[PDB]
Each structure stands twice: as C-alpha cells, then as structure tokens.
Amino acid sequence: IAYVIGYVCVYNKGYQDTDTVLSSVTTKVKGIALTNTSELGERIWDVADYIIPPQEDGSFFVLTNMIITTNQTQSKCAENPTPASTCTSHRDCKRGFNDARGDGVRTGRCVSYSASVKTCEVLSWCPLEKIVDPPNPPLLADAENFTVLIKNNIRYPKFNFNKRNILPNINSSYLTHCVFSRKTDPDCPIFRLGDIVGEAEEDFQIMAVRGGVMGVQIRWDCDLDMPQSWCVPRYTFRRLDNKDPDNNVAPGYNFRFAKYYKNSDGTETRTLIKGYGIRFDVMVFGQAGKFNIIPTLLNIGAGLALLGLVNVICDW
Amino acid sequence: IAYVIGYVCVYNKGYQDTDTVLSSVTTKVKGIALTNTSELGERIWDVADYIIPPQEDGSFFVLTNMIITTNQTQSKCAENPTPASTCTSHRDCKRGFNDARGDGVRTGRCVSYSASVKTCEVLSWCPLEKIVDPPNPPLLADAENFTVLIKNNIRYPKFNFNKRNILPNINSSYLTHCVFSRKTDPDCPIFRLGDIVGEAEEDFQIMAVRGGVMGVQIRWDCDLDMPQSWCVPRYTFRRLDNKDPDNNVAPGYNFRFAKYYKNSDGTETRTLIKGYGIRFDVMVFGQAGKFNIIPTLLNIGAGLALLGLVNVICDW
Amino acid sequence: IAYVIGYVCVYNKGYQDTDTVLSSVTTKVKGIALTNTSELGERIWDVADYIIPPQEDGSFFVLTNMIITTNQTQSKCAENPTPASTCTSHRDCKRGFNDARGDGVRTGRCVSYSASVKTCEVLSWCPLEKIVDPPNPPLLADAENFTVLIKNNIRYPKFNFNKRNILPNINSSYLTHCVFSRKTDPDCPIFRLGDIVGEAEEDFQIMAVRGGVMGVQIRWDCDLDMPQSWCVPRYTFRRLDNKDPDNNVAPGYNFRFAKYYKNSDGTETRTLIKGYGIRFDVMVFGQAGKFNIIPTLLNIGAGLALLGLVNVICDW
Ligand SMILES: NS(=O)(=O)c1cc(NC(=O)Cc2ccccc2)ccc1Oc1cccc(Cl)c1
Ligand SMILES: NS(=O)(=O)c1cc(NC(=O)Cc2ccccc2)ccc1Oc1cccc(Cl)c1
Ligand SMILES: NS(=O)(=O)c1cc(NC(=O)Cc2ccccc2)ccc1Oc1cccc(Cl)c1
Ligand SMILES: *[C@@H]1O[C@H](CO)[C@@H](O)[C@H](O)[C@H]1NC(C)=O
Ligand SMILES: *[C@@H]1O[C@H](CO)[C@@H](O)[C@H](O)[C@H]1NC(C)=O
Ligand SMILES: *[C@@H]1O[C@H](CO)[C@@H](O)[C@H](O)[C@H]1NC(C)=O
C-alpha cells in the first residue's frame, strides 16, 4: 500500500526537518492620560510616567491605579491596628521581635495609635502606608486607549532564515496612522491596549482596579519549502493570572517602589508608591521545516516494513 | 548495501540523542567617557551614568546620544507648531480633545506660541521637549572604546552537563589585561563595543547618532561522545533593526525617562531625558547529543527495510 | 521477538509525540531587616529598599551588602594610590590619557593625594569611591530569613495545555501562613531565601559578603496520556557562579548605581552605591508528550525490520 505511506508522509510532515526560532522583541507605548483628584489636583501622565520600567525587552508595565504615601521618615512610631499588635500592657510587645506584617521591628514600650486602642511601637518609615482599598474607578482608566507598537525579528539558525513581522508590502505612510484590527487591518503591528484586553474576553475597566498579567503570544509557523510569502506570524492574547480569590495569593498585579528626597536639613525622606497595573508579556515561539532526503528515505523504509505486518494481518 | 546505511548513520547523526541548552548570562561594562558641550560644560560619565538599566541579565543598554529638557512643571501651556494645531479662532481648539502627538490635552482658549502663529493651550509639563535633531557627532562617541565582559553558564539537563565559557586553560592573570580578537585572542570573553559593531559590517560613529539594536549570539554545539575539550562556544554578532527608512516606523533605538525633583516651595519638577543608545541582545542557543542504542537500532532497521526498495528498483 | 520491540516502545517513549513548554513566572519577596552602624545609625529596610530592580519577571536581586560614597561633585580631583599613577614630576601625567582604572581622565598638572605621595589630577565625581573591602558580617544578613512566593504558569501549545504550579487541592487559608519544606510542605511555592541557598550546599552568611548568582530551576515533565493529577513541577537549585578565584574575573556579584540630587545652589550631586547581592535566576523548562498513531506504526515497522537482522545474526 504505497498510497497509504505516501499520504502518511504527506500529512504527518515526516519528510520535514524542523528547527526552532530565535527571536527579538521591541515594544513602544504611545498615549496620554489625565487624572483629576483632590490630592493631586489636575494632572497629566506622559510616556515617562505610566511605564515604570522605562524599557525592558520582552514585556512592559502600564500603571493604572496607585496609592501614594508622602514624606516618610525613619522613626519610632505607632502600628496599624491588628489583633496581634494590640496593647494591654507594656510587657505585651516583645523587644526586637519581627512580625509577619513587615511594617517594622517591635520595641519594648508601646504607644496609642488612637484614643480607643494602643499598638506596639516600631521602627519604620512613618507615616505608615494606610491600609485602604485602591480607588475605583482607576485613576488611569484613559490607559484603555493607549497604543503599543511591537516589532519582532526572528531567525532560524540551521536554515539561515531571517524575518521581521513588518511585511514588505506595508509602507511607513500606512504605518503612521494605522491601528490593528482583525477584520480590517490584520497586518498592522500597532495594537490598542483596550483591544488586547478585550480579545482575551476581559474588561479593561475592571482589570485596571487591581491589575493583572496578560500574555501576548506570536506564533511563527513557517514552511520553508514554500516561498517566504507564506511565512506570516499569528497573534493570540491570553490572561495569565487567576480570577478566583479562593485558590491564589494576593490576586491581581501590583508592586511597590520609592522616590528618595533629601531635605534642606539633610534628613532623607521617601515617597512610597504602590502601583497596580496590567503587565503585558510578549511570548514568541515557532518551528520551521525544510526538505531533507534522509528522513524521507528512513520513513519510507519503515512504512514498507510495516506493510509486512499489514500483509500478515490481512492473511489471517 | 550496509556501507550506505552506515555512512548515512555516521554523517546524519541518526545514532545521536539530542537535548537543548539552559543558559545564564552576566555582562559587565567597563569604560569612561568625556563630553564637552556648552550646556553641560565639561563632563565625565562613569559606569553608573551611561548604562540606564543598571543590571538586567541577558542584555544591556549603552547610552550614546541624548536630549535633555530641564525644569518641567505642570501647567497650562502653549503647543509646538503643527498644521493640526494652528489657531485661527478660539473655537478651533476642541475642549478636552486628545491629539495623536501626545504632548497634552487641549483646552478652550488658545494663545500664541510665537508672534507669527498661535497654537492651542495644553495641560502638560512645560517647557515642552523641543523638536530638534540629535547632536552630531554623538556626545558619547568615546563609547566606541568601552569593554564588556560576558560570563556564560550552560546546562544540558538530560545528560547532566554543566559548562562555562571561561575555559580552564585560562587564568585570571591573562584575563586581567585581555581583549577579544579573532586572530590573536579567540578565547577571551572581554569584547570591545567598537569591535562588536564592526564585526557586523557597521560603523559605530554613524549608528550611535540614532542608536540601533545589535544581537550577540553564542552557539553551544557540543558532541558529548567526544571529551569535553571539544565543547567550545562560537560567537557571532549581527544587526537586528532595519536601516531602511521607507518600511519601518521610528528608525533607530531610543527611549524617554525622567528624574523627579522637589523644589524648596514643595512644587514637583522633572527633567525629561530622551536617550538614543545601542542595545546589545545576548542570545544563547545550542543542541548537544549523546550516543544511544535504541535510535541506532531503529535507523539500522529502517535502512535495511529501504534496501528492499533499492533491490526492487535495481531489478527493473 | 515482538516482546522485545514492545518493551522498547514502552520504555523508550517511542510512541510518544513531544512538545516544549511556554512559561511565565512572577516572584514576590516579603521580609524586613534592621541595620545598626555608625554612619547610618539605626536603619530599617523595607520591600522597596533591598530589591534594586523593583520588579523584573524571571529573576530578582536581593541586596545584602553595600558601599556608599555620598555627596559626589564633578570637579578636578586627586587620584587613588596606584603604581601607574604616582607622580615624580609634572611631565609624568599625560594630558587627556585614559587609564584602565576608569576613575577619570588625566590632566597636565598633578597634586598630592597625601603628604607622602602625589598622583595625577583627574576630572571626576569626588570624593572618589574609597578602595576598601565590604563590611563583614554583611549589613543585610537578616535577608537570610526573607520569603519569596513564586507563581508559575505554563502552556503547551500543540496539545492546548494550561497549568499553574499552585495545585487545586491547595487553598488560600493554607497559603497565608505556609512555608516550603521538602519533608512537610512539598506543594508550597513560598520558599525561604536561607533554605534556597542552603539546599544548594552553600552558606548564606559567607556568600552574602560578596554575593553570587543562584539559579532556581523548575521542571515541568508531564505525561498527558495519564490524567493531569500527575503533571507536577519539580524544584531544583544550583549555584551558578564560580567560587575559585584563580580562573574567573571579579568573583562574586555586584553592581553600581547612583541617586541624583540637586542642591539649593543648583549644582548637581550624586550618591554612588556599590551593592553586592544574591541574584536568583528562575529557569523553567520541560517537555510533555501525548499519544500518536503514526510514530507508533513507524517504530513498529522499523523494529520488525531489525528483527530480520536479528534472525540473520542468530542463523550464524
Ligand atoms: N518612567 S520612570 O522614569 O522609570 C519612573 C516613573 C515613575 N512614575 C511616577 O512618578 C508617577 C507619579 C507622579 C507624580 C506623583 C506620584 C507618582 C516613578 C519613578 C520612575 O523612575 C523609575 C525608574 C526605574 C524603576 C522605578 Cl520603580 C522607577
Ligand atoms: N545608571 S542609573 O542609576 O540606572 C541612571 C542613569 C541616568 N543617566 C543620567 O542621568 C545621565 C545624565 C546626567 C546628567 C545630566 C543629564 C543626563 C539617569 C537615571 C538613572 O537611574 C535610573 C534607574 C532606573 C531606570 C532609569 Cl530610566 C534610570
Ligand atoms: N526599590 S527601588 O525603587 O528600585 C531603589 C532602591 C534603592 N536602594 C537604596 O536606596 C538603599 C539605600 C537606602 C538609604 C541609603 C543608601 C542606600 C535605591 C534606588 C532605587 O530606585 C531604583 C530604581 C531602578 C533602578 C535602580 Cl539602580 C534604583
Ligand atoms: C477612548 O476613546 C474613545 C473615542 O476616542 C472614547 O469614546 C472613550 O471614552 C475613550 N476611553 C476612555 C477610557 O476615556
Ligand atoms: C579609542 O582609542 C584609540 C586608541 O586608544 C583612539 O585612537 C581612538 O580615537 C579612541 N576612540 C575615540 C572615539 O576616541
Ligand atoms: C532568622 O530567624 C530565626 C528564628 O526566627 C533566628 O533564630 C535567626 O537568628 C534569624 N536569622 C538572622 C540572620 O537573624
């Protein structure tokens, strides 16, 4: 049955010799955002404000919601209310003990956080970060309308193949005022953050309150036997974190950083920013194949050997 | 024809069992640069100045040219000249409209940027970044002479193989005053930035004006049947971005960041730096093989099966 | 010998069709530490202090020891003692010559660093970084007791498989007060830095003095023929760097960064921090297999073909 083995080699790509992809990614974010709060007045956020890591290859972080604590100085200080931190006598707090909250290290004497309750005195940057819910709606909801240009460049080493996701039919005039869309502009690398989140069956406005990790995946599945015109990337978007709050720890995505200031007196103070944002991971993978005689001959020989079993079984 | 199948197994590595490489890279940049300009006077740039991401594993950024806008404050403000931003009456500017330039959000009234023309007021950090060409020659042309030490460590999991690119015939005395060169010192990991760019058929002085992305690739192709003395990495360098300006968007490589200052009055100002630099991507790939009986037997059986087809064809 | 080929296919996974893993990692470090020195007095280090890269996906840097040079102003200056920088006359120093130390560029005249010796004047930030060993024991030795939560998410594209390292049998109540331990809590992702370093046959206290690169590796070896309950990651830890000082360059792991301040007079000063820390690399790899008819048939045919050689050899 030469037809059977021929069809098997045709559809299983057994005659193919395959190789992996070596990729480079560069993303640039463009947009502006306006915030209007009592504390910050009226404010605008340029490209240098809402991208906390200014440029890291492979991913980017877009700040969406955020909490500030200003004028923090190292001092002995009160503690946030907590059942493990309540004071009934000066002997309750253990000198030098380190707690799981991580606000600071305890001391012997303890002071009153307020008139009603007293908590252990700790060494820390005070005033401490107030334990409050993040603002809703998010400050940077305008980050729904940002754009991101993703430039990709792959190489297949063994076959000596180089390619970029910007197809050569496209020109700069079209790319200046272009926006990606599956129905209209499938070849445009300039995505919209709102579209990226929406195509993963999510809502950006709800996501931005606590953040989340979103992955953008690009598939480079190119058949090098056919000309390079059919070597085209395919874009997919997925949500990487977990919605369910009963299984994971610290739902959402956020992190803390600081800005250090030196006063006129020489004392060092710091402003602590806790930022929640959407982190976009760019993942590139693929596998490309070419023609080779030796695998074809090996597969043909093995198929003809299996034809012996086919005949033996047909005999019975 | 046992000779044919034997030679096929010998050269095609059908008897081989292959595995991929798990790698780690660490790079240190050493050098100094001096600049002499009217705005900054005479200046020297240490290791902490021209490497904007201080240490990220896998790649590093070397600043070469820059545009600085100092003492930027939040304010209602003028707009850079642009055909879409020209004022003929106060009703031209749309309240709250967001433009594609991204300098700021528009307001109702508009003032004169200069005596000749008037542009819409915007909420923004001002004075705005002036639209000017980057300085030529670049400020950090001395970055042609920097050195970079690349320490690489690979592991093949299945075969339990660990290796480092620093060969054990080398000692610290040689590596203290060493530099890489194909003809003289091929085993030295200490490359020169000018040499790295030159080996890719590029000119550092021209390309540093607007930047570019270079990839430094290391190939770990080791045959574990032979002793480990033949497991040696191979270095290659190539240019990742595109020179041609009529196909891509925003030619070159650059990014913007900010330094935030607090005045005596408490108002917050920022210095906006737009830096054009050379980003070096370190990409490590390879595949190592070892002897295995089962693939050898399978290939031998398939070859002997194909000998049947060979005999059948020879009969005709 | 159908039994032989059957056993070969059973144990060699010949019938399997394999695919690689596409992974994402997220690490959160929790802990607090106190330092007591003459220069810094009594100090506490929060999450925003000892993690110099605030959040980079795939690795994190935990500061352990440091050298601070404060109030550095750009000016003409003296030089650190060095046999290549000693002065016997004003003609010894070469104007504009760039040295291998990298402290600064030389000038014509040279000045007495101290009463005993004189060195070349250089343009640099001063006072220069004093050449002294890092403090022992390290300032941030308390970083032995920190915790790190590692959340992993893998996908196999061809088989359409998605998984996380947080098993469904685990709940948030257990994960709130959990810690990893091989004997007691093997499914907990919350590791301890001291445990991570210790299980690599290292001591944290001696390693933190000069730092080092530690690799945390996760293996996702899942057989998809069996249910997903057997798809479980496996954790291993290695010491990536080299202890031997006679083969490598700059033993340990450290890097330099700066904090820029603006004085009242408008002059710009900077504080230069040289930080030694432990860099933890998270490397995720794996390979998953499923059942496919065509490889099974090909392997069976080749085995039956090799049975011919088996019979021929047995005949002799
Ligand atoms: N784009 S940036 O230069 O990297 C940058 C942006 C911001 N964002 C804000 O300040 C937002 C804000 C504005 C006004 C008041 C309060 C908050 C803060 C610090 C920044 O610097 C770095 C650099 C490296 C790592 C890190 Cl964590 C920070
Ligand atoms: N090597 S560094 O510490 O990371 C660093 C270097 C510079 N470079 C300059 O200031 C050059 C300069 C000097 C004087 C006037 C004008 C320009 C600026 C800020 C830096 O800090 C960070 C840290 C993380 C992310 C980012 Cl975007 C920045
Ligand atoms: N967690 S952080 O925001 O990223 C951060 C932490 C620290 N660490 C200290 O200041 C320790 C210290 C405290 C007091 C006196 C002397 C030293 C310094 C600067 C920081 O900012 C960046 C941001 C991006 C890149 C870089 Cl290199 C730095
Ligand atoms: C995004 O832009 C559209 C139209 O330009 C506007 O209707 C929408 O409100 C914007 N999104 C946000 C969050 O403001
Ligand atoms: C690099 O150094 C060489 C000699 O040390 C010198 O001739 C050359 O001009 C230097 N490069 C630059 C850009 O100054
Ligand atoms: C870590 O904690 C244990 C107990 O909580 C303590 O015995 C040990 O001294 C701590 N390590 C350091 C370096 O302080």
Numbering used by the authors:
A (entry chain C), B (entry chain A), C (entry chain B): 43 to 358
Q: What do the study authors state?
A:
Here, we report the cryo-EM structures of the zebrafish P2X4 receptor in complex with two P2X4 subtype-specific antagonists, BX430 and BAY-1797. The overall structures of the zebrafish P2X4 receptor in complex with BX430 and BAY-1797 are very similar and show a chalice-like trimeric architecture with each subunit containing a relatively large extracellular domain and two TM helices, resembling the shape of a dolphin, as in the previously reported P2X receptor structures.
In our experiments, BAY-1797 inhibited ATP-dependent currents of both zfP2X4 and hP2X4 with comparable IC50 values of 0.14 µM and 0.24 µM, respectively. In the BAY-1797-bound structure, the phenylacetamide moiety faces the outer side of the receptor, while the chlorophenoxy moiety faces the inner side. The BAY-1797 binding site also consists primarily of hydrophobic residues, which are the same as those of the BX430 binding site. Furthermore, both Asp91 and Lys301 are similarly involved in BAY-1797 binding, despite the structural differences between BAY-1797 and BX430. The main chain carbonyl group of Asp91 forms a hydrogen bond with the amine in the phenylacetamide moiety of BAY-1797, and the hydrophobic part of the Lys301 side chain interacts with the phenyl group of the phenylacetamide moiety by forming a cation-pi interaction between the side chain of Lys301 and the aromatic ring of Tyr302. While most of the residues involved in BAY-1797 binding overlap with those involved in BX430 binding, there are also specific interactions in the binding of BAY-1797. The amine of the sulfonamide group forms hydrogen bonds with the main chain carbonyl groups of Ala90 and Ile93. Further close inspection of the allosteric site revealed that in the apo state, the side chain of Lys301 faces the inside of the receptor, which would cause steric hindrance with the pyridine group of BX430 in the BX430-bound structure.
